[PDB]
Nucleic acid binder design. Structure first.
Length: 1122
RNA sequence: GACGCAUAAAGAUGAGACGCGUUUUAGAGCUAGAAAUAGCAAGUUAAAAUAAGGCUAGUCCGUUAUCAACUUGAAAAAGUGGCACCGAGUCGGUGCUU
DNA sequence: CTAATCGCCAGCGTCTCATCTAATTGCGTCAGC
DNA sequence: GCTCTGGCGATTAG
């Protein structure tokens, strides 16, 4: 007996079929186990498996990072307390305790209920003097009197905890930048640097610069309007750098210095001055103007007598808010009394009371209040403010996302420099506080673990706790920046032990250029066939036409080389379009940088180069590059080092160094490069050298050279296709096992992926898994593995009237797999099947094995939102001591699996034990506690005298079978899902597909009237379809109300055309599809869903255990338990 | 079938940081009143938590992938279910055979 | 003191750095013959 | 040669 397997792979399904030799599906008699009353089930060999798609590991990553940002921040404050503790032991020895316990309710506090002062009068006075924290910060910055230590700590902690962003490097001075009339100093500097009496346009001032946007479309208009220049730099060649930075890196005018090379504000300025000193300013005022623009974009109050602009801006905002509020209140009271209580007392709307106490944002408040004041009188200023987002604003909003940290730090400095006079400790350890504020872990060091994390790579120099003060004396920076890169680069395919070489490297470029050049097929009149060049000619031509220029075309090789002879016009070439795809770029760059010849041509020096290009590829910071290059300082001049350290390379190659240079034969003593250079009159390239038996370069690879999951998990692609592939691999294995341990003859695969290599990998995996019997001479193909496109099956489907609709049932996966197998087997035989009646019989079969994979749930504990306190038993505590009846908490957890527990429980007024049997919900949070010791766990839950052996665990999608062939799957401890299929006969499906798509052609225009005539003489199929649906829904669905609503809805619309009627009959199958109930739409009526919330009807049913294929089964009669 | 150079649109993993949002508490409400109530005044901020927690005690870990039942085995992992013919409402009927 | 109904709710925006994959073009190779 | 779908708080009725 010989058979064949057909498969169809997807993201949420897989379909399998087995055909013997005539496109016929066999049938067999399998046996069942358990305490039931069955012994044999007759099953057909075709079906599908259904699961739910996997998901990427990105979201989890984000959560992890967020965690790491709350562990460090809480430390950032604790350090500060360590510096204040002793001093704070003298003023109030309970300040920190109250700050810690402020969250608890009034009764759980073991101290006073006022955090700061411990009094009522002092607290009220403090809140009255400083309405906000910004008043306190500005007062501490600007005043000169002795303050209280508590206020200093509060201000410092508020600045340390919220510390701005780190996107700008350098120094920023708000005092010298808030004055935006500096442009006159720019004009006078421009006049003094270039004496030609420049002209300018009067009318453009600081405010016009303020309104300018980052988009160059408005920037060009601003620059042409502000000054009509006299030269290229005047128009836009220089002012762009002054306004924002020299973003272009190409010469706009020769007069800048020589060319244009400056960039924006980063760590490059300290070297970019080398561009200007050679051509000695506007470059100093450019920074001031750019800083002025970028700082006045966010700050309104310019500095006159204050060193704190941010606090002044916030105070001004607060005062304007108060004034606008009182004016609006008075006017609204005077002109529209009826709306008053609607806007200032109701929290359920978007009024002012819903803006402060409710949950509305600025946009909703403005959109709700604009029409209210639109029809009023005396609302011009408020209306114009509402269009600029300045009406009744708050201090802490989203717009604060663009505050640099260099602002915050500035204020901190001031707050110390005064109060250090009265407190010696502040002067003693000011630098500690600054370092606490402005310390960040570099992105190339990562976590600071001690070998217990699978994410870290850091290497230490000693053994001691790591703090911001002794960071650079415990951790190692070069050894960490090296491992940050060495843990991601590829290995050499030929030898899986060596690291690859950087893409730009002298050895690698030599290999590439010689490999390309050695196969030149030059032809001449005298020599009719393409010969191969000799070693000395290559050695001459490489330096003649490669070490002097980087780019060479065909003309250069045809003319320049043959100048010594007369055959320059008689040599023709082939295999090159117009140039060579190789160059000695690194050689030319090092020649320009070093300006020396012998150091590059000498072989003995190449080792040094092998490091000079290595570091320039690994590191990215200037400091570490300089530290590594310090070793070779004496080799070149200081100017040479300064110009060299500005060169950066990226990328990596694919061939290591041990293979290109370092391995040689024992009978020749030459390396691959040597042979490729001087093979002789007949030359061979890398591919011919490596795959050669005359020299011992083959066996070296063989002597230089595993579970399934760890090999699957290394493919490239989305995890969904990986899940599908892993399922298919096991489906094939079980199918092989079932039918007598005889391997198939063909396997036909078809992929279907959406957002020609994954198919080649799956085919490789299956072929390597199947072909094991290895011959001894050379290689045997016991089985084949065919690959098929998706067009052929679709054409065979749409040509012979084998239509399909996906809304009826889940039977189309198996039919697709069967058709794939049939078409492939037929097609690989001739180098359109026969007896189509067999195909129709197979596709009209009522028995197909559809199984849904059972799974235990994983994920988050419960819903992420925190709910207000209320008296209920569904609230989950947030910490252990926070009782949800006083602080709120989470609700609606997620269950992992359920358990069938049978035992006694006290009940009734008599307080007596009664036998009971119920399900239970073991949440994700409680899984470990149950699995560690179940008996105690569910004895503390209420039950007692529990039988140990009768406990059964039921994952999601467990299958129960009830009376009259009614199947329900399980979804939770208190909900069920439908589990049956509808097997509609083929003729109804064929008619129903043709009725739809009525207005659009399906084939030739001359062969379409027959389909119409068919639909008019078979119009009366709709009643039969409705009767079929009604009978099925009466037998297995039990949805009488929805069914008799659907019946009336259909009966009311019998006069509509056929197209709409059929297109809406298609919509009615949502009532009978398995899975979760869903709401569908008829013509105009809407039908709501019916959900099964009672799970007590499956405790007397039969529990079915199923295999992945679905043919092996186990049945348990639950009526005998108890 | 696989390997080394010449290409412009998407993804897939890991690291370092900002700005909001939500819960509880603090910021003394007044007057007419027997009562349920009514009239007025105020509103912009701060503290703590941000998966319950763990031991290996780190300025570290805790939402990805894997998962029918029974027998052996801590785990790794290994094993367990007859064949032909006629038919078709979720699979039946007949004949050999352990 | 439980079973059939109808209805409402679910955390979200942004910035820097590094390493891998891959479909088609033309280049010359092996695998084989 | 060449190859979306479970939880939760209300309603009236057996």
């Amino acid at each position: 007996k010989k058979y064949s397997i057909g498969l169809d792979i997807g993201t949420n399904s897989v379909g399998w079929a087995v055909i013997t030799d005539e496109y016929k599906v066999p049938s067999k008699k399998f046996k069942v186990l358990g305490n039931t009353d069955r012994h044999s089930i007759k099953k057909n060999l075709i079906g599908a498996l259904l699961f739910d798609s996997g998901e990427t590991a990105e979201a989890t990553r984000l959560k992890r990072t967020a965690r790491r940002r709350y562990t460090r921040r809480k430390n950032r404050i604790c350090y500060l307390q360590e510096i204040f503790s002793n001093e704070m032991a003298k003023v109030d020895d309970s300040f920190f305790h109250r700050l810690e316990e402020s969250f608890l309710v009034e009764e759980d506090k073991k101290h006073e209920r006022h955090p700061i002062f411990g009094n009522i009068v002092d607290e009220v006075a403090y809140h009255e003097k400083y309405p906000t924290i910004y008043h306190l910060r500005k007062k501490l910055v600007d005043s000169t009197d002795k303050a209280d230590l508590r206020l200093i700590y509060l201000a410092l902690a508020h600045m340390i905890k919220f510390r701005g962003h780190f996107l700008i490097e350098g120094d920023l001075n708000p005092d010298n930048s808030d004055v935006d009339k500096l442009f006159i100093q720019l004009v006078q500097t421009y006049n003094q640097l270039f004496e030609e009496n420049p002209i300018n346009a009067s009318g453009v001032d600081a405010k016009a610069i303020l309104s300018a946007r980052l988009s160059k479309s408005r920037r060009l208009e601003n620059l042409i309007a502000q000054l009509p220049g006299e030269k290229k730099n005047g128009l836009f060649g220089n002012l762009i750098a002054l306004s924002l930075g020299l973003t272009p890196n190409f010469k706009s005018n020769f007069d800048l210095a020589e060319d244009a090379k400056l960039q924006l504000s980063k760590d490059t300025y300290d070297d970019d001055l080398d561009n200007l000193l050679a051509q000695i300013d506007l470059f100093l005022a450019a920074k001031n103007l750019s800083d002025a623009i970028l700082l006045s974009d966010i700050l309104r109050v310019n500095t006159e007598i204050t060193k704190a602009p941010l606090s002044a801006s916030m105070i001004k905002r607060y005062d304007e808010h108060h004034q606008d509020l009182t004016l609006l209140k008075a006017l609204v009271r005077q002109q529209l009394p009826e709306k008053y209580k609607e806007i200032f007392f109701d929290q359920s709307k978007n009024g002012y009371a819903g803006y402060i106490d409710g949950g509305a944002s600025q946009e909703e408040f403005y959109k709700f209040i604009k029409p209210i004041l639109e029809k009023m009188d005396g609302t011009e200023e408020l209306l114009v403010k509402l269009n600029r987002e300045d009406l009744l604003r708050k201090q802490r909003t989203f717009d604060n996302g663009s505050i640099p940290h260099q602002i915050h730090l500035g204020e901190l400095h001031a707050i110390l420099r005064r109060q250090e006079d009265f407190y010696p400790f502040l002067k003693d350890n000011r630098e500690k506080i600054e370092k606490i504020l402005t310390f960040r872990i570099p992105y190339y060091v990562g976590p600071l673990a001690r070998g217990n994390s699978r994410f870290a790579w850091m290497t230490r120099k000693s053994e001691e706790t790591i703090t911001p003060w002794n960071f650079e004396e415990v951790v190692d920076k070069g050894a960490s920046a090296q491992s940050f890169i060495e843990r991601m680069t590829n290995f050499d395919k030929n030898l899986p032990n060596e690291k690859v070489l950087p893409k730009h490297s002298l050895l690698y470029e030599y290999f590439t250029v010689y490999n390309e050049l050695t196969k030149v097929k030059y032809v001449t009149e005298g020599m009719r066939k393409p010969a191969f060049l000799s070693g000395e000619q290559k050695k001459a031509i490489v330096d003649l036409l490669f070490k002097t220029n980087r780019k060479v075309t065909v003309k250069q090789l045809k003319e320049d080389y043959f100048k010594k002879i007369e055959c320059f016009d008689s040599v023709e070439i082939s295999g090159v379009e117009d140039r060579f795809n190789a160059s000695l770029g690194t050689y030319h760059d090092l020649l320009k940088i070093i300006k020396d010849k012998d150091f590059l041509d000498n072989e003995e020096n190449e080792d040094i180069l092998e490091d000079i290009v290595l570091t320039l590829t690994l590191f990215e910071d200037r400091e570490m590059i300089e530290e590594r290059l310090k070793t070779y300082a004496h080799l070149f001049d200081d100017k040479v080092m300064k110009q060299l350290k500005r060169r950066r390379y990226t990328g990596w190659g694919r061939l290591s160094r041990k293979l290109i240079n370092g391995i040689r034969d024992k009978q020749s003593g030459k390396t691959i490069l040597d042979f490729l250079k001087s093979d002789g009159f007949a030359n061979r390239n890398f591919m011919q050298l490596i795959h050669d038996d005359s020299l011992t370069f083959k066996e070296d690879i063989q002597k230089a050279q595993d579970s399934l999951h760890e090999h699957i998990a290394n493919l490239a692609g989305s995890p969904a296709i990986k899940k599908g592939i892993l399922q298919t691999v096991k489906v094939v294995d079980e199918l092989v096992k079932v039918m007598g341990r005889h391997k198939p003859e063909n396997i036909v695969i078809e992929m279907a992926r959406e957002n020609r290599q994954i198919t080649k990998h799956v085919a490789q995996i299956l072929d390597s898994r199947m072909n094991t019997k290895y011959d001894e001479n050379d290689k045997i193909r016991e089985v084949k593995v065919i690959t098929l496109k998706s067009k052929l099956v679709s054409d065979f489907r749409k040509d012979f009237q084998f239509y399909k609709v996906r809304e009826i049932n889940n039977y189309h996966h198996a039919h697709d797999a069967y058709l794939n197998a049939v078409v492939g087997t037929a097609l690989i035989k001739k180098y359109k099947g026969r007896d189509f009646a067999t195909v129709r019989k197979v596709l009209s079969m009522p028995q197909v094995n559809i199984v849904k994979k059972t799974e235990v749930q994983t994920g988050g504990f419960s819903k992420e939102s925190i709910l207000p306190k209320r008296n209920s038993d569904k609230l989950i505590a947030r910490k252990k001591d926070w009782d949800p009846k006083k602080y709120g908490g989470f609700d609606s957890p997620t269950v992992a699996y359920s358990v069938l527990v049978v035992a006694k429980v006290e009940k009734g007024k008599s307080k007596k034990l009664k036998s009971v049997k119920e399900l239970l919900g073991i949440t994700i949070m409680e899984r470990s506690s149950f699995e560690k010791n179940p008996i105690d766990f569910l004895e503390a839950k209420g039950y007692k005298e529990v039988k140990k052996d009768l406990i059964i665990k039921l994952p999601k999608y467990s299958l129960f079978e009830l009376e009259n062939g009614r199947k329900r799957m399980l979804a939770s401890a208190g909900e069920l899902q439908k589990g049956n299929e509808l097997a509609l006969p083929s003729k109804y499906v064929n008619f129903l597909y043709l009725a739809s798509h009525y207005e659009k052609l399906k084939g030739s225009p001359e062969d379409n009237e027959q389909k119409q005539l068919f639909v008019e003489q078979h119009k009366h199929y709709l009643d039969e379809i409705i009767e079929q649906i009604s009978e099925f829904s009466k037998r297995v669905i039990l949805a009488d109300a929805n069914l008799d609503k659907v019946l009336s809805a259909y009966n009311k619309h019998r006069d509509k055309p056929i197209r709409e009627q059929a297109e809406n009959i298609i919509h009615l199958f949502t009532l009978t599809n398995l899975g979760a109930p869903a709401a569908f739409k008829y013509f105009d009526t809407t039908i709501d869903r019916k959900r099964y919330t009672s799970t007590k009807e499956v405790l007397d049913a039969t529990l079915i255990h199923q295999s992945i294929t679905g043919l092996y089964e186990t049945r348990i009669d639950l009526s005998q338990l108890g």
